[PDB]
Amino acid sequence: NEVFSRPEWMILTCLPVPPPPVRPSISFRGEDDLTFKLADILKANISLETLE
Amino acid sequence: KKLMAQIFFGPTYYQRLRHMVDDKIHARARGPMQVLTRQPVEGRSRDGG
């Protein structure tokens, strides 16, 4: 559906960052595994940009 | 009054199992909720729901 979908939109050019509620910090801060994965993705993107 | 039907009677060995109601009774009324989902926690010992 063109209004709400497009074949190009399937190829994600931007990854939304879930807000803090989606990634609660568990007290032991104790960031969840999803936060670590997001940090790794951001580091990879930064390294790629620096290389380019 | 004497029972109409005679009753089978006698000693027998019995064991009290660890399962007791005192530790198997729980009740919740707006207790703590999980931060992840803002829903009641699990476990009576932790005042769950």
UniProtKB/Swiss-Prot annotation, chain A:
Domain of life, source organism: Eukaryota
UniProt-annotated location(s): Nucleus
Processing and modification events after translation: The tandem 7 residues repeats in the C-terminal domain (CTD) can be highly phosphorylated. The phosphorylation activates Pol II. Phosphorylation occurs mainly at residues 'Ser-2' and 'Ser-5' of the heptapeptide repeat. The phosphorylated form of Pol II appears to carry, on average, one phosphate per repeat. The phosphorylation state is believed to result from the balanced action of site-specific CTD kinases and phosphatases, and a 'CTD code' that specifies the position of Pol II within the transcription cycle has been proposed.
Chain positions covered by the region annotation Lid loop: 24-32
Position of the signal peptide: none
Comment, domains: The C-terminal domain (CTD) serves as a platform for assembly of factors that regulate transcription initiation, elongation, termination and mRNA processing.
Subunit details: Component of the RNA polymerase II (Pol II) complex consisting of 12 subunits. Interacts with DEF1; the interaction is direct and serves to bridge RPB1 to the Elongin complex in a DNA-damaged dependent manner. Interacts with the Elongin subunit ELA1. Interacts with the Elongin subunit ELC1. Interacts with ASK10. Interacts with ESS1. Interacts with RTT103. Interacts with SHE2.
Membership in a protein family: Belongs to the RNA polymerase beta' chain family.
Note: Mutagenesis experiments demonstrate that the minimum viable CTD contains eight consensus Y-S-P-T-S-P-[A-S-N-G] heptapeptide repeats. Identical and simultaneous substitutions in a number of consecutive repeats are lethal: 'Ser-2' -> 'Ala-2' (14 repeats), 'Ser-5' -> 'Ala-5' (15 repeats), '2-Ser-Pro-Thr-Ser-5'-> '2-Ala-Pro-Thr-Ala-5' (10 repeats), 'Ser-2'-> 'Glu-2' (15 repeats), 'Ser-5' -> 'Glu-5' (12 repeats), '2-Ser-Pro-3' -> '2-Pro-Ser-3' (15 repeats) and 'Tyr-1' -> 'Phe-1' (12 repeats). The binding of ribonucleoside triphosphate to the RNA polymerase II transcribing complex probably involves a two-step mechanism. The initial binding seems to occur at the entry (E) site and involves a magnesium ion temporarily coordinated by three conserved aspartate residues of the two largest RNA Pol II subunits. The ribonucleoside triphosphate is transferred by a rotation to the nucleotide addition (A) site for pairing with the template DNA. The catalytic A site involves three conserved aspartate residues of the RNA Pol II largest subunit which permanently coordinate a second magnesium ion.
Name of the protein described by the UniProt record: DNA-directed RNA polymerase II subunit RPB1
Organism listed in the record: Saccharomyces cerevisiae (strain ATCC 204508 / S288c) (Baker's yeast)
Curated annotation (Swiss-Prot), chain B:
Cellular localisation: Nucleus
Family: Belongs to the RNA polymerase beta chain family.
Miscellaneous remark of the record: The binding of ribonucleoside triphosphate to the RNA polymerase II transcribing complex probably involves a two-step mechanism. The initial binding seems to occur at the entry (E) site and involves a magnesium ion coordinated by three conserved aspartate residues of the two largest RNA Pol II subunits.
Function according to Swiss-Prot or TrEMBL: DNA-dependent RNA polymerase catalyzes the transcription of DNA into RNA using the four ribonucleoside triphosphates as substrates. Second largest component of RNA polymerases II which synthesizes mRNA precursors and many functional non-coding RNAs. Proposed to contribute to the polymerase catalytic activity and forms the polymerase active center together with the largest subunit. Pol II is the central component of the basal RNA polymerase II transcription machinery.
Subunit structure: Component of the RNA polymerase II (Pol II) complex consisting of 12 subunits.
Name of the protein: DNA-directed RNA polymerase II subunit RPB2
Provenance organism: Saccharomyces cerevisiae (strain ATCC 204508 / S288c) (Baker's yeast)
Native organism taxonomy: Eukaryota, Fungi, Dikarya, Ascomycota, Saccharomycotina
